[PDB]
Every structure is written in C-alpha cells, then in structure tokens.
C-alpha cells in the first residue's frame, strides 16, 4: 500500500509545481551570506553540531553558486560575540572565501547575535554596487532573539529604500521579527522566512537558495551593459600579471587595453571592464528557457509505446510510468524524466521532431 | 604477480623460442592482452604501418610524468624479445617482433588465423546444463580434495603426481595424506584464474620434451576459446594434454567433439555483499555468504555452529586460531582472508574513526591497522603473540676485529643472499649453511 501513499505525495508535491512561469530572473547577482557563530550553534543537537553542518553546507553553497552563477561576487561576514566580523569581501574567486571559511572551521563559534550591526555593515558593503546587480542577502540564524544597539526598523526602511532583499533560513522555529523582515523586504511575501525540519531539508533549502530569483515588473531596471570577450595566450616566457604582480606562463589578454589577467570571469584591473566567455552567459539559459513538466499517461488508456523513448528501456507495469513531453508527444521513464528535467536542459524528442 | 610470473617465464624462454610463440595470432592476442596499456598502445599504433621508429620519436611523444611506467613497458617489451632495438645510424632503432606484428595484424583483420582461434566444428549445445554442471562437479571434487574434507572422487593421477612432487597441498608419503602447506593455503587464498595460472605454470615447468611450444600455443588458444561448442580434436601432444585437462573438468569432451566450459572463460579473464563478514569482539561470525565449500574452508580455522541460507554463524576460537597456526598457515594469510572478507557497515565505521583520528594527530599513537582493532587487532595481537621469537641454528662467526672486515664479510653475504642476521653493535652475523663455503672463500681472499 506504499505506492498509493507515494502517488498522493507526488500529487501534493506536483500541485506546487503545476504553475511554471518564464519570469524575468536576475542574472547579475549580488549574494551575501552572513554567518552567526554564537553559543546556539554550539549545540550538538544535530550531528555533529550546527556549526559544523553550516560550515559544510556553506562550502557546498559556495561551490554551487559559483558553478551556476559565475557572474556574481560573493561576500561573507561572520557574527561573533556581539560583533559582526567581515571575513570575505565580494570577489570573483570563490577560493578566497573557501580559505576564509576554512579559517572559520578551526575557530570556535561563541557569543550573541546582532542583526542590526550585521545588516548595517552588510548594507555598507553593498553600498558601492552597480545598478544592474541584484543585491540580496542570505541570513542563517539560530537564536530566538537578537541583542541590538538600536532600532531595527530604520534599518528595515533603509534596506527597502536601497532595493536589497533578504531571505532568512532560521534554525529552531519562526521569529516574528525575522518574519517581519522577510515580509516587508519581500513585498509582503512569506516565501522567504524558511525553517528546516532536518538536515536533509536544510540541504534542499540550500539547493533552493542556489537558484536565481525572479524580479518585479515595478522594479524596472532594463538597460544594456558593456561587455568584452578577451583572448587567451599560451606564451613560452613567464610574464608578470596585472592583478597579482607575478610571472605567468599563460593568461588571457585584455581585449581593450591589452593587459593580462590570471582568472575569468573577471573584470579588467586596467581598462576596468568585465571579461567573460560565451559559455558563462549561456550557462543560465535553462533558467532563461525553462522546461515543461512531463505527464504520466494513465494506466487505463491505450499506450503509444510500451518502452522508454529516450533511455530505451521497458516501461514497468499497476500504474503507468510514462512521463510524456507534450512539446514532443513522447513518453519517457522516470529516470530520463529526472535527468532531462534537472541535469540535461533539452528534450531530445523535441530535438528529433522538426519545427 | 600473475602477469609478472608469466612475463618472467617468457623472458626465461629464449629469443627464438619466443619468436616461435609470436607466430600464431591466438598466442599474439593473448600476449597482447597480457601487455600493459602503454606497450599495448605502442604495438597497436605500429602494427598497421611497416615504418620502424627510432626511440627518440617515442620519447618526444611520451609525456615525462609517466616516464617510469614507460620504462617498465619498454623493459618488458625488450626483455620479452618482442622488440628488436638496434642502434642503427647511432639511434636505437625500434622494431617490433615481425611475426608477432603480422599475426596480430591478421587477428585484428580477421585474416589468416589458420584456426589458431580454434579448429571449429560449431555444434553448439546448452552449456549451463551439461558443461557448467560437469565443470562444477569436477571442480567441486578437486576443491574439496584440496580442502581435505572427505570426498570419494579423487583427482587424476597426473595432477596427483604433480601435487606429490610440488609443495602444494603436500601428499606426505610418511602420512599417506594430502596436507595443507602454507603454499597450499596460498593457493586457497588465490583467485581462480590465479589458481589456474599457477597450475599451468607448474605443469609447464614440470613437463618437458611433449613439445613445450605446442603446450604454450595450445594453452593460449585454450584461453582464447569460447564456451559451448564442439571442435576438432591439431597436434597430438595438444590432444593428449587436452584429454588431461578434460579429466580436470575444464572441457566437456565426448571422447572427438569437445565442449569447453566456463572455466576457459575465467582462465581468459575475470567474468552487504556475498563473502562479506561482520567481525565481532566476541569473535562471532556474521557471514553474508554460504556454501559447503565455505563451511569446508572455514572448518580449518573457525569454530562454527550451523549452516543457514546466507547467514553462516559461529565463533572464532583460539583453538581455531592455533589450529590455523600449527599447520604452518601464516597469520598474514589469515588476515589476507579476513581483510578480503570485510563488511560495508564496519568498514564505513572504521573509515569514520580514521577520519576522526586524522585531525587529532597524524600518528594517533595507535597501531597501524585499518580494519577495526577491537576485533581485528585481537587476532593481530594473537598474530604477534604467535611467532614472537627469532631462532638461529647452525654455524656462527664471532668476535670480529676490525669493523671493516666485519662489514665487508657481512655485506658480501648480503649481496649473495646468504645472510640471515647481523648486529653491528656485537660485530656478529649468521649465514645459511649453503653460503658458508662461499663466505669462507671470500674471507681467505
């Protein structure tokens, strides 16, 4: 009787994903993850302790964020002992923040949090940020309270005025002030103050936070942006780099001012212009071109085919596991449905079918 | 060391005898299977063009990161006389063995094979019902014979003589009984293709002129053969040892049509799990495995209780431990079996403990044993407590003078491999009786 429970669970899951929309979603991102390292995360209540798992999950979050969206800079400020401590400036290299987080590994989480100080200096760090960049902050929190020097509502008003959004991933339960932050910052939405139920749910939440977010019509900033593809050289001689001032065998060359760099996707240090590859911009095209869900045909009706169109395996036989791409009119197995919907970003049935 | 042993044997085989072995495509195919990936790539590249190459071109092609492995490949290539490297025009002119080259070429093209892949009759039948069943029967008989548990179907007299002569499972004539040597337990620990290759290496070593290259070529094509078909009964020496390996149960022969079982395929190549055992501090056995062969081999070194479907239970006793020890069976052999019979949950727990102890200290101030020492070191402590002495018997030279001379004589013995023990601090050393005369002669000179 487990298949009936699985079917009704899949129905209640798919009721949320019935509506799939091609919203304009931010690509030039600006993501900040502040960390609290206080007495609450010293609890071993989840194995091994909250500090260790948020360290590991932040490592994964950095990797996933830079993989999916390499067109953003990442800054991390830790919270400790009534002080918020900047440990990671916004940068294109994830490895810097990886090393900073590795420093955070060995040190000891202790103290009390101050979202006022944390969000204030996060605002100040987010101040010299260009218009197209979408300023947004992830906040992790384990306390049920917050010691603060002054008002939080002035900070809330300033953050709303400066067009920065937040998303809170609280640990224990809901905190009303964090609900207020999420609602007021997020145009009244309640889809940003999220509480885990276990570590797997925390993993899923982090994966959800990886994704780009849609933007609002009223928050209109539709413009152009200057761009430059550089050229890579492979020289015999080591050559001084502009950024780190040291001898480099290879390195890209600046398309505009003909200097050289060491890493991409990065902006020029000399002509001060952003340099990318077409792979980097095409990386988010699945977000730009979403994929429709695939429908299982019912077991009662007559079937177009009895084996999987894509992976080429036999469909198993009570119910019918034939997920149909209505855009290509072909049914598929669950494994292929998962792979095409998540890993792949094209429908080979729609590739074979001519338009 | 199976490929090492066979390669060593073929290096012992002289150059023109090797070239005779390189004549036929089936032998060349099997030998190509033996060669490491670099040399395999080299010969498949050069086999389709009659352009000899100098060593410099190959060296320029080779990335220097794996240059040691390249050296190993070409050392095997030259020492097998598969290469003809001559310093032509001052450059070590590289040349593959041409008979090997053309026979590989014909094998790859499907050209002239001269039925080296087999004089085919192609009267295919079912093999799971006759060939596999007779093969499993005969192999079960010889396997329980080699275990020592009683079984009526004795092996052939040829293999019986080979066991009598060889140091494998000693048929001690004073006792009249096959007895588990340490080499016998090594054979027991061996993989099935390892056992087959040891058997054929021993049989080839003992067999003399019976043409040795006929046996070699026939063995290589027999490995090259496929299951479940009739074939023509060829050389007569090949035919009579073919009847011999029929009596081993390798082939299902109807006295001219013969039907090779799956054992030829396993001889050619290999194909909470089975064979996975959960260790216990209480020495209880939670095997995820069962066979009467499993019980028969566990009877030698484990006190068991009963047999159930996969669940073979028991308790390892020190009586069982010392029963293994007194046979000459090595505790290293015992832990070879044990560490080849570990279980997923316990090895995951061991790796979790290892990664926990890695961050605390690199040494951890613990003995080096990855398998969990709560159960595993108890045998290993019993292993160290088993031998725990060093015995030197026979001649001994004492009270040296000059340290010079002591080091010279002791170093000389080490070079010739006759030194058994030495102590700088006492200026004394012990040498084997065999090397006594050589050491004395060197001392005088």
């Amino acid at each position: 009787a487990s298949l009936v429970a699985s079917i009704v669970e899949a129905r209640k899951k798919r009721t949320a994903k019935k509506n799939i929309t091609p919203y304009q979603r931010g690509i030039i991102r600006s993501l900040i993850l502040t960390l609290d390292c206080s007495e609450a995360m010293l609890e071993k209540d989840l194995r091994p302790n909250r500090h260790a798992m948020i360290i590991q999950y932040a490592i994964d979050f950095v990797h996933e964020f830079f993989d999916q969206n390499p067109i953003s800079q990442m800054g991390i400020i830790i919270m400790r002992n009534g002080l918020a401590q900047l440990v990671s400036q916004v940068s294109g290299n994830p490895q810097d923040h990886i090393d900073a987080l590795k420093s955070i590994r060995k040190q000891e989480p202790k103290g009390n949090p101050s979202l006022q100080n944390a969000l204030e200096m996060a605002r100040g760090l987010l101040l010299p940020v260009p218009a197209h960049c979408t300023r947004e902050v992830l906040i992790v929190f384990g306390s049920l309270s917050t010691t603060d020097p002054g008002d939080i509502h002035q900070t809330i008003d300033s953050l709303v005025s400066e067009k920065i959004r937040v998303k809170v991933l609280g640990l224990s339960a809901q905190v009303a002030i964090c609900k207020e932050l999420c609602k007021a910052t997020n145009y009244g939405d309640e889809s940003f103050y999220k509480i885990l139920l276990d570590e797997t749910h925390l993993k899923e939440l982090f994966n959800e936070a990886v994704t780009p977010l849609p933007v609002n019509k009223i928050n209109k900033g539709f413009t152009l942006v200057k761009m430059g593809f550089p050229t890579r050289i492979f020289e015999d001689t080591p050559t001084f780099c502009s950024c780190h001032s040291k001898l480099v065998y290879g390195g890209y060359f600046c398309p505009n001012c003909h200097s050289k760099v060491c890493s991409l996707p990065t902006v020029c240090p000399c002509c001060d212009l952003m340099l990318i590859l077409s792979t980097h911009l095409a990386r988010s095209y699945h977000h730009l071109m979403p994929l429709k869900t695939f429908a299982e045909v019912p077991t009662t009706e007559k079937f177009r085919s009895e084996d999987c169109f894509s992976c080429q395996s036999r469909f198993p036989i009570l119910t019918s596991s034939r997920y149909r791409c209505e855009d290509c009119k072909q049914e598929f197995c669950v494994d292929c449905d998962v792979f095409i919907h998540e890993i792949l970003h094209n429908c080979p049935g729609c590739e074979s079918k001519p338009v | 060391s199976l490929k090492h042993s066979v390669t060593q044997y073929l290096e012992e085989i002289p150059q023109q005898v090797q070239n005779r072995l390189y004549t036929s495509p089936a032998t060349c195919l099997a030998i190509y299977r033996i060669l490491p990936p670099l040399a395999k790539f080299f010969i498949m590249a050069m086999v389709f063009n009659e352009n000899e190459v100098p060593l410099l071109d190959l060296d320029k092609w080779v990335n220097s990161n794996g240059k040691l492995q390249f050296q190993n490949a070409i050392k095997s290539m030259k020492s097998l006389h598969l290469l003809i490297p001559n310093k032509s025009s001052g450059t070590l002119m590289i040349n593959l063995n041409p008979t090997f080259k053309i026979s590989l070429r014909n094998a790859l093209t499907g050209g002239e094979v001269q039925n080296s892949f087999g004089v085919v009759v192609e009267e295919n039948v079912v093999s799971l019902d006759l060939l596999d069943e007779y093969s499993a029967n005969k192999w079960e008989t010889i396997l329980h014979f080699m275990v020592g548990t009683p079984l009526a179907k004795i092996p052939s007299e040829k293999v019986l003589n080979l066991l009598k002569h060889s140091k494998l499972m000693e048929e001690v004539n004073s006792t009249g009984e096959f007895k588990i040597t340490n080499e016998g337990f090594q054979f027991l620990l061996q993989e099935i293709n390892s056992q087959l290759w040891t058997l054929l290496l021993q049989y080839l070593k003992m067999i003399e002129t019976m043409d040795l290259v006929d046996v070699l070529h026939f063995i290589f094509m027999l490995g090259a053969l496929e299951v479940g078909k009739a074939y023509k009964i060829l050389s007569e020496t090949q035919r009579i040892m073919l009847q011999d390996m029929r009596d081993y149960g390798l082939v299902f022969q109807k006295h001219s049509i013969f039907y090779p079982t799956k054992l030829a395929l396993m001889l050619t190549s290999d194909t909470i799990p089975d064979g996975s055992l959960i260790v216990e501090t209480n020495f209880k056995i939670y095997s995820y495995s069962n066979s009467p062969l499993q019980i028969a081999v566990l009877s030698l070194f484990v006190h068991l209780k009963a047999r159930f479907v996969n669940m073979v239970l028991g308790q390892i006793t020190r009586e069982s431990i010392r029963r293994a020890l007194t046979n000459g069976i090595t505790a290293d052999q015992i832990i070879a079996y044990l560490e080849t019979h570990a279980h997923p949950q316990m090895r995951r727990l061991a790796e979790e403990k290892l990664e926990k102890k890695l961050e605390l200290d690199p040494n951890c101030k613990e003995p080096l044993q990855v398998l969990p020492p709560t159960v595993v070191d108890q045998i290993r402590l019993w292993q160290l407590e088993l031998d725990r002495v060093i015995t030197y018997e026979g001649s001994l030279y004492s009270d040296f003078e000059t340290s010079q001379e002591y080091n010279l004589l002791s170093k000389y013995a080490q070079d010739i491999g006759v030194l058994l023990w030495k102590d700088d601090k006492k200026k004394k050393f012990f040498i084997s009786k065999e090397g006594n005369s050589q050491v004395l002669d060197f001392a005088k000179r």
Partner: protein, 66 residues
Amino acid sequence: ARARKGALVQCDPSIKALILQIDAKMSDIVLEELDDTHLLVNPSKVEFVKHELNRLLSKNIYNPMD
C-alpha cells in the same frame, strides 16, 4: 680468540631468566649469555628448549577457556 659451536637466540631479560630456570632444572645446555637480547645454546637441544619454552608460557597462560 674462540669460535664455539652454538645457536644464537634473540631474547629478552625475562625470557632469558626463564632460560636460566631451564638451566636450573637441567643445566649445561645453554652455553653463555651474550647480552640482554642474545644467548648461545647447545645446537642439539635448541628445539627441546623451544618446546620447553612453549610449556613455560603454557604455565604462564595456557588459554584453556574450558
């Protein structure tokens, strides 16, 4: 200036004192005491001494468990 015919044994002070007790209950087999880790013994009685040593640690433990 001597070279006597003996069997050198790697040993310990404890298990050398056990060798001395072996000499006490029948003497004259073990030739001389070289150092704490070395001894010289009659080559004809090396495995007689070994089996009696086996009896010695049998009397130490015997691992009966019956």
